[PDB]
Amino acid sequence: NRWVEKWLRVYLKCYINLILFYRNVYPPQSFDYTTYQSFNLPQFVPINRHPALIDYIEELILDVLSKLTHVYRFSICIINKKNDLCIEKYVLDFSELQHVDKIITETEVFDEFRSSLNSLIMHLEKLPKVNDDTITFEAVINAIELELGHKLDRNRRVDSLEEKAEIERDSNWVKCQEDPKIKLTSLVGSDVGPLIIHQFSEKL
Amino acid sequence: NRWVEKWLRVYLKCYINLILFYRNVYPPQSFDYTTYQSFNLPQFVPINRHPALIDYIEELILDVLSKLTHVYRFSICIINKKNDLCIEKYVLDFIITETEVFDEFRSSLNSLIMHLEKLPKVNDDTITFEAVINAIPKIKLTSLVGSDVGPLIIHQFSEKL
Amino acid sequence: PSILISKKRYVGFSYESPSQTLPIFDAKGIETVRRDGIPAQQKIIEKCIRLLFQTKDLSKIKKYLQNEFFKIQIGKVSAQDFCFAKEVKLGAYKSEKTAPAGAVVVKRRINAEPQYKERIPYLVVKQLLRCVSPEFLEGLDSEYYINKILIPPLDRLFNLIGINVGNWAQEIKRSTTTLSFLIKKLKRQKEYQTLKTVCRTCSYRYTSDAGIENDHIASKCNSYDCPVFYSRVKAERYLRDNQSVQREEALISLN
Amino acid sequence: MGRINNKIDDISLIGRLLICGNSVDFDIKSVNKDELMISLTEFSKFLHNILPSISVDIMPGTNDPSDKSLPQQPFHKSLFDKSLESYFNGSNKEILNLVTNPYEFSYNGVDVLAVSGKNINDICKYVIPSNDNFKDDIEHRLDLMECTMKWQNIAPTAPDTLWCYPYTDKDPFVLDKWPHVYIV
Amino acid sequence: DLHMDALLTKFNEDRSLQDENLSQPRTRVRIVDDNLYNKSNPFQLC
Amino acid sequence: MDQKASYFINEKLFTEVKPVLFTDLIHHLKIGPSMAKKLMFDYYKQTTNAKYNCVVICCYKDQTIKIIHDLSNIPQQDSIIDCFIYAFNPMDSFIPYYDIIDQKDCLTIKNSYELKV
Amino acid sequence: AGLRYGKRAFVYGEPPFGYQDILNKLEDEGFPKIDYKDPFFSNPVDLENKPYAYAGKRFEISSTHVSTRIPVQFGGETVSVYNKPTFDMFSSWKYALKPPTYDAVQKWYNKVP
DNA sequence: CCTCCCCTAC
Ligand code: SF4
């Protein structure tokens, strides 16, 4: 957790921004290609410049990093708005992540991130174009041993910003279930020492 | 089957207040919006300020749960004035511990909030409600999340003419 | 929205017509309309009142007040909004000890005489209160200014709500460092160049010249009524400040 | 490097490469160290990948991290990647050379005067209600440069380009020897 | 006047593959600066 | 060699998704630019399963270098002095990445001076 | 014409108040017609028990945060969980916060900030 | 608590 958090946050930011841009979740005019977005990105990743969207993405990534000790799968679901049905699912496996109980040069980490993001972009390019006008996205995680929404039964008298952040992050999730022609396409992840991440995608 | 009664009472009160506020059945600035929390949800749950309406809602809920075995469908209908037509209709069908029933009630309320927040606005002084209990044209139906772990599985769905 | 402090003292948003959309900031008797202080207190009070009336959020007001207090303590203020101006009556004073601060400033300046009933600048910045004239520029204990200029009026305005402002104020080979040094130095230099260009353009009114001897004339302007003069003198002082030691440190690191 | 043209007989005649400023573009009003460091690392990668084949001379620019005035001193030994530390030991100056913004290279006896263009750019920011008989054309700027040589003054607009204390009793911007080639 | 593949076939198949020993690369022409160490750089200030 | 180069290109194009340049072949196989371009052209053939985008650039007269985009109307075809394949792009946006390269013995032109330590 | 109730359906009593009479009835009961927002803290950290007293006047300053909001009560008595939560293995969870709308981003971009 | 001084409201 020394340098793992920063690289993981950068990778999550690149992943979310690429998925938003290439699936037309937000207008392409609001995205710009850049390498610095308060962190040196491994590539020229198109990052949205809407302040509310940036804050939302950063908060979600921080929450996921906080809960990383108990979550083994992070998914961004693409759901239509005419009906609440998921049409595309991108799964980011976290099978123990090779957690650093006790850390490697940044160059190889960025090279592996470049390979994984290039695989993701190559998969996304061949997908059919998605129309504008109310296509939206959704975030779902798969947990091992946790229970959220139950930390507000003691009146949670906050004292500092850390306690308020913990309370708001515990209460910002709801319980969901596991739920044809589902097509599974495995992608390229990172095989570096500290970070062992597997990438998946779903269609239909 | 003990705490399901109290949690269903709270969930039904939230259901009725949310439907009355998000739709324009009763005017805004008549609900208590920034004081209560429903199921530890981050959203603001509105509660009607008039004690008489709250008491009437509580009596309705108590009457519904009194004959819960005989009912298989509890629904609330939205009737437009001068036409007496159901513009929209929100319908819910029908070893368990605290945590699971609490969780599915929280999820169902969150799904209802999500569905209600993205609905078109409604004009003023044009809508009245009607609660119907069931004992035994072009329609748009929306499927919502309901409780399934407990033996009293409910199905939440909404309709729109 | 309205606040009634005392007799002939109130502030609120006025709507002279129902068709009017933007509220009008109407104040009567509070420090915003009183010329018995400094522009900084008027601006701070107006901003706090507008925030309270629009958002009703005490957290935003506390954040703004803490940020302003921190800026004042650091020394990042405009240095112009901290100048007092009160009328002086040189012959209507019962005794020398009863004269106000501005009378003492004028008496020091005379030893030249002013005219009767003049708004005179006093107490610019930096042991009784009885008096530096805006001798400051050729010459600040932020605690005194903060407390005795902002705590009383903000406390008068907010004790009606039930919050103590004083509690908020109580809390209050190397390519890394050298790059930051160049960033700071270049930002300062560009700000100074922009100020000089603005001064030259303004002095063009009298000089009607563009080349040399126009900037030389503009550099001799000592107008105390324009913030650009204060910004220019601050930048000039900062260029001749300890940055010379910073330049020496960069030279050692580069070598 | 001759990788594209594939005619070594002509590529090998390009003795030196000259960068005349504006290596990196950024907003100095709102900038931090990280993004500028990324840009300088990219520049250092390019230099390291081009240095073994050709010599490089680098000039400060208007938006480069150097002094806002016109006599901009050489950049630093720092602000470059550690892979270039061998070129900065002092003994290797013929292959890499960081130089003042105005300079007179004696390229094989051909004296060439190089200016990053701040003087002409500062002259062009003035609208002069005269010279009725070009508007933002190459001919007008060429005439301005020719006048600059005629007046023997590199920076006619001293308050705009020049800074405090250029020199004492001997301003270098007043020409003392015409060069063979003039570059703006 | 022709498709891209035609031009690629015309140009690439007739590659010279000559003078590219890569063991004795051609030396770049020598260009020197006589002002590297002479004296008194006029624009070098403190 | 038409075998090592093809294997390297296939690996760098499919196993680790990254655009491959002819300069990559120059640095890997220790060959001159002409041989690298010929090998790239050879790999362009025998490609019945085409799963990449070719980035081709041409050299005009008067020392002008252009990147082909339209691929249907190339201006001034009579003035072309050379045309080759610059890279194989597995994605749509080229955007390559550049790293530190040790050109110990792959240089075709060297400066008259040598690095002195 | 309208939506059918079903095979067997019962109806409850008519609500006592309408759309226009609700505010008048609320005012008659002794409540203000419109309850304007009192001064409040958006950040619960900045609460610090400030509203204790002011010159013998007690003020009630609360927060709109989730932590400080009283749970919805039924029958005049608060309802809350007493037993400790029982986590189950292999659970799935969903983010509740709503992302910005496509139309909002389009409008922000078209305004040319 | 006292006078002195500032200066805004009505
Ligand atoms: S007065 Fe203000 S504006 Fe006029 S010159 Fe002096 S500084 Fe520039």
Numbering used by the authors:
A (entry chain E): 2 to 103, 107 to 183, 195 to 219
B (entry chain D): 2 to 95, 107 to 148, 195 to 219
C (entry chain A): 1187 to 1297, 1302 to 1316, 1321 to 1324, 1327 to 1330, 1332 to 1336, 1341 to 1373, 1420 to 1502
D (entry chain F): 241 to 373, 388 to 438
E (entry chain F): -2 to 43
F (entry chain G): 1 to 117
G (entry chain A): 512 to 624
Tell me, in the authors' exact words, what the paper reports.
The Rev3, Rev7A, Rev7B, Pol31, and Pol32 subunits are organized around the mismatched duplex DNA in the same pentameric ring-like architecture as the matched complex, with catalytic Rev3 alone making all of the contacts to the DNA. The structure shows how the Polζ active site responds to the mismatched duplex DNA distortion, including the loosening of key protein-DNA interactions and a fingers domain in an “open” conformation, while the incoming dCTP is still able to bind for the extension reaction. An open fingers domain creates space above the nascent G:C base pair and many of the van der Waals contacts observed in the matched complex are lost, including those from Leu1087 and Val1091 of the fingers helix αxB. Of the two metals “A” and “B” observed in the active site of the matched complex and associated with a two-metal ion mechanism of catalysis, only metal B, a Ca2+ ion, appears to be coordinated to the dCTP triphosphate moiety.
Assembled from catalytic Rev3 and accessory Rev7, Pol31, and Pol32 subunits, the translesion DNA synthesis (TLS) polymerase ζ (Polζ) plays an important role in the replication of damaged or mismatched DNA in eukaryotic cells, and in the prevention of cancer. The B-family multi-subunit DNA polymerase ζ (Polζ) is important for translesion DNA synthesis (TLS) during replication, due to its ability to extend synthesis past nucleotides opposite DNA lesions and mismatched base pairs. Rev3 makes contacts to the DNA via its palm, fingers, thumb, exonuclease, and N-terminal (NTD) domains.
